[PDB]
Amino acid sequence: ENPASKPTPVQDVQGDGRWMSLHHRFVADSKDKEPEVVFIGDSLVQLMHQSEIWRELFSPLHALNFGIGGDSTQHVLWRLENGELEHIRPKIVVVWVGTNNHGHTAEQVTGGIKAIVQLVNERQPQARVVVLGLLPRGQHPNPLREKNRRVNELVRAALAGHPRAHFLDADPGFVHSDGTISHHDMYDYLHLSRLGYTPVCRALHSLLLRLL
Numbered sequence: 001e002n003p004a005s006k007p008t009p010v011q012d013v014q015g016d017g018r019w020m021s022l023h024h025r026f027v028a029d030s031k032d033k034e035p036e037v038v039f040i041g042d043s044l045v046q047l048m049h050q051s052e053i054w055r056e057l058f059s060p061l062h063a064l065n066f067g068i069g070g071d072s073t074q075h076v077l078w079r080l081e082n083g084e085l086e087h088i089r090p091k092i093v094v095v096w097v098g099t100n101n102h103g104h105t106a107e108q109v110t111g112g113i114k115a116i117v118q119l120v121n122e123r124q125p126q127a128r129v130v131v132l133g134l135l136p137r138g139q140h141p142n143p144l145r146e147k148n149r150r151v152n153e154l155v156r157a158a159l160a161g162h163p164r165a166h167f168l169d170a171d172p173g174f175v176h177s178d179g180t181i182s183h184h185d186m187y188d189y190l191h192l193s194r195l196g197y198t199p200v201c202r203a204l205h206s207l208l209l210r211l212l
Contacts, residue, residue, distance in 0.1 A: 004104045004112030007078035010070070019068065026066040027083035035088060036062040037208065040076055041096035043069035043191060044135065053197050057205045061212065072101045073112025077119060085123045092211060093120050094204070096132040098151055099144075099190075106150035113155050117165055128211050129162075131155060132204070133169040139189045141179045168207055172199040 010019040030038075037058070039045050046067025048054055054065070066084055068075070076097045095116055101109040113131060120129050133155070134148035152169065159167045174181050174196070181189050185196040192200060 002104075002108050002111045002115075004073045004101055004108040005077065005115035006074055007081050008074050009078050009082075010075055022068050023079055023082070023084070026064070026079070027086070029064050029066075030084055031087045033064060033088070034062070035064040035090050036212070037092045037094065038064045038066060038084075038088070038090050039094045039096070040066040040080065040084070041094075041132075042067060042071045042076075042100055044099070044132075045094075045096045047191060048197060048201065053194070053201045057201055058208075061208060067096075070100055071097060072104070073097050073109060073116060077112065077116050080116065080119050080123070085120070088124075090124060090127050092128045092130060092208060093124060094130045094132070094208075095120075099134045099137065099148060106147050106154060109147075109151045110154040110158060113151070114158055117159070117162070121165075128164040128166065130166045130168055130204075130207060130211075131159060133167065133171060135171055135186075135192075135200075136175050136181065137186070137190045139181055139183075145175070166207065166211070168204065170200045170203040172203070 012019060045065060046069055049065040049067065066079065098109045098113055101112065117129050117131065120127060133152040136145045136148060138144055156167045159165045174185050185193060187193050
């Protein structure tokens with residue numbers, strides 16, 4: 001198997017069960033709410049909710065945010081199969097995962113992303129699926145930049161022929177001419193500051209408004 005597309009939960013090796021607590025909260029959310037849009041993915045999705053761009057741009061859309069820090073594609077796949085898509089009928093599902101898939105080749109990660117789109121197409125066939133490109137990372141040029149770039153190419157190629165599947169590259173150009181990423185945009189060269197989220201969320205919001 002491709003480990004990126006084999007659904008599996010995160011095993012708790014620390015002891016406080018926080019991952020499973022989050023999953024259960026999201027399952028409860030889906031059970032009790034009627035979102036038009038659901039966002040699912042890793043910390044880039046999760047921390048988008050810690051506003052203050054979420055309330056102005058995405059709350060009005062009737063959205064649920066199921067981002068979980070540290071998740072790889074297989075974790076998101078498992079969550080979608082194990083309750084987070086139940087009791088809802090969203091118009092759009094936004095997917096943003098793959099940067100945490102350490103140990104998986106770019107091809108494998110792409111396979112994971114395609115599995116997530118397929119699952120969504122099966123369980124929520126009426127929904128359009130938006131997949132965000134993986135952002136660059138690291139202060140200077142490094143292998144993860146090339147990897148994430150390659151994933152984006154392969155995913156873009158994969159979704160090109162997909163009527164209601166949309167690939168969005170939300171990168172406004174975080175990697176500068178000198179090859180650096182500014183801590184003003186990504187405070188730790190991975191997670192986005194408020195300043196970093198602005199153009200990303202702006203790009204997403206526009207697309208969501210078209211589709212909607």
